[PDB]
Amino acid sequence: FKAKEVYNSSELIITQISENAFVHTSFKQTNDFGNVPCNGLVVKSNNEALVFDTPVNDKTSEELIKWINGTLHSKINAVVPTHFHDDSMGGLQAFHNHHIPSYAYSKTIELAKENNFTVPENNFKDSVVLKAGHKKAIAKFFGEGHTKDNVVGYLSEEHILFGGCLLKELEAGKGYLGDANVSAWSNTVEKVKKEYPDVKIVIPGHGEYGDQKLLDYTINLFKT
Ligand SMILES: [Cl-]
Ligand SMILES: [Zn+2]
Ligand SMILES: [Zn+2]
């Protein structure tokens, strides 16, 4: 499947990557890395949708929600911020304003509270299986890396791994390490690689998606 841009408002870009899945990209202004693109994932089936990661703020989250409802004609069954930083969770309040349930790893909820961020509603201690139509997606904690709380999402039918910020794009630098566990990062991603051996598409938290090579690249980037 050839990636196709299907929406571009400059603040929000949506790229179709399978018959049923889309990457949403929003932008966070930074001091150390300029204007940073930030990825999430939308899966649709039977006029229902799952969303991994909020766009970076409420405004673009409202924009994404309006597009899923109004153009994909789909209700959003759940949103999963894959870690507590704003480029996965910064627009969580917009989702709660639409009464969309949020699911997150226990540590994401702990760190949201510690930082006085919007708090995901439904705690999972290891993994949770979420449904859109007949499709099942797994959100799962494999270990620490980019943060102590980072989780991935996996769509088994389409073999799509949303790696979140635990996964780097090919040739990426190490990025922001303030909250990272660099002693665990490679081991964590090695466990991801072994659990999803049929993976066809890997989406990083920032930059260009790819295939299984992004796991290998990330594993080696952080080998100590
Ligand atoms: Cl980063
Ligand atoms: Zn982050
Ligand atoms: Zn990130």
Numbering used by the authors: 28 to 251
Paper text:
Here, we report the biochemical and structural characterization of two membrane-bound MBLs: CJO-1 and CIM-2, from Chryseobacterium joostei and Chryseobacterium indologenes, respectively. Both MBLs confer β-lactam resistance on producer bacterial strains and hydrolyze several antibiotics, although with impaired efficiency compared to NDM-1. The structures confirmed that both proteins adopt the characteristic αβ/βα sandwich fold of B1 subclass MBL enzymes (0.59 Å root mean square deviation [RMSD], over 220 Cα of CJO-1 with CIM-2), with two Zn(II) ions in their active sites (respectively). Specifically, a hindered access to the active site with the contribution of a Tyr residue in loop L10 and the presence of a positively charged Lys residue in loop L3 limit hydrolysis of cephalosporins with charged C3 substituents.
CIM-2, like the MBL CIM-1, was found in C. indologenes, an opportunistic pathogen of growing importance in the clinic which can express 19 variants of the soluble B1 MBL, IND-1, while CJO-1 was identified as a putative MBL sequence from the environmental organism C. joostei, first isolated in South Africa from dairy tanks. The sequences found for CJO-1 and CIM-2 were LLNC and ILSC, where the cysteine (C) residue is present at positions 16 and 20, respectively. Pairwise alignments reveal that CJO-1 and NDM-1 share a 25.1% sequence identity, while CIM-2 showed a 23.9% sequence identity with NDM-1 and 74.6% with CJO-1. Aiming to understand the substrate profile of these enzymes, we crystallized both CJO-1 and CIM-2 in their soluble forms and solved their X-ray structures using single wavelength anomalous dispersion (SAD) from data collected at the Zn edge. CIM-2 diffraction data extended to 1.56 Å resolution, and CJO-1 to 1.34 Å. CJO-1 and CIM-2 have the same conserved active site residues coordinating Zn1 (His116, His118 and His196) and Zn2 (Asp120, Cys221 and His263), and so have highly similar active site architectures, with similarity extending to the positioning of their active site water molecules. Loop L10 adopts similar conformations in CJO-1 and CIM-2, which are distinct from its conformation in the NDM-1 crystal structure, likely due to the presence of an extra amino acid in this loop in NDM-1, and further differences in amino acid sequence. Indeed, Asn233, present in NDM-1 and in most B1 MBLs, and previously proposed to interact with the carbonyl group of the β-lactam substrate, is substituted by a Tyr in CJO-1 and CIM-2, as observed in some other B1 MBLs such as BlaB and SPM-1 (34), and in all characterized B1 MBLs from Chryseobacterium spp.. Reflecting this flexibility, overall conformations of L3 differ between NDM-1 and CJO-1/CIM-2, and between CJO-1 and CIM-2, despite their high sequence identity in this region. However, Met61 and Trp87, which are part of a hydrophobic patch in NDM-1 and have been observed to be important for binding some inhibitors, are not conserved in CJO-1 (Thr61 and Thr87) or CIM-2 (Thr61 and Val 87).
